[PDB]
C-alpha cells in the first residue's frame, strides 16, 4: 500500500492519512471483536460441556451449539474476516509509518 499511501509531502495529506487511519482502526476493532466474541462463546460452552453429565439432554444441547460455533470458525466467512483483519492491520501499520516518517522529516 505504498502506492495508495505514499510518503507524505504536506500537512493536509498527513491529516487525511490520520482520518483514514482512524476509520480503519474502527473497522479493525469491529472485525476483531467478532472473532473475540466467537471465542468467548466457545469458551462458555466448553465450561458447560465440561460440567454437564455426558448422557444428559443439557450436554446434547450444549454440544449442538458448540459445534455450530466451531462450524462458523472453520467457515469461509470467518476465514475472510480474519484475513481482512490481518490486511487492515498491515495497511494501518503502513499509514502509521508514513505519518511517523513525515513528522520526523518535518522536525
From Swiss-Prot:
Post-translational modification (record): Dephosphorylated by PTPRJ. Phosphorylation at Ser-75 also attenuates the interaction with TJP1. (Microbial infection) Cleaved by S.pyogenes SpeB protease; leading to its degradation. Degradation by SpeB promotes bacterial translocation across the host epithelial barrier.
What does the record say about tissue specificity?
Localized at tight junctions of both epithelial and endothelial cells. Highly expressed in kidney. Not detected in testis.
Coiled-coil residues are 11-74
Subcellular location per the Swiss-Prot or TrEMBL entry? Cell membrane; Cell junction, Tight junction
Query: Which positions carry Phosphoserine?
Result: 75
Q: Where is the OCEL domain?
A: 1-107
Q: In the record, what disease is this protein associated with?
A: Pseudo-TORCH syndrome 1: An autosomal recessive neurologic disorder with characteristic clinical and neuroradiologic features that mimic intrauterine TORCH infection in the absence of evidence of infection. Affected individuals have congenital microcephaly, intracranial calcifications, and severe developmental delay.
Q: What family is this protein classified in? A: Belongs to the ELL/occludin family.
Q: What is known of its domains?
A: The C-terminal is cytoplasmic and is important for interaction with ZO-1. Sufficient for the tight junction localization. Involved in the regulation of the permeability barrier function of the tight junction. The first extracellular loop participates in an adhesive interaction.
- Quaternary data: Interacts with TJP1/ZO1. Interacts with VAPA. Interacts with CLDN1, CLDN6, CLDN9, CLDN11, CLDN12 and CLDN17. Interacts with PLSCR1. Interacts with LSR, ILDR1 and ILDR2. Interacts with TJP2/ZO2.
Please give the function described in this protein's UniProt entry: May play a role in the formation and regulation of the tight junction (TJ) paracellular permeability barrier. It is able to induce adhesion when expressed in cells lacking tight junctions.
Official protein name in the record: Occludin
Question: Which part of the complete sequence is present?
Answer: 416 to 522 of 522
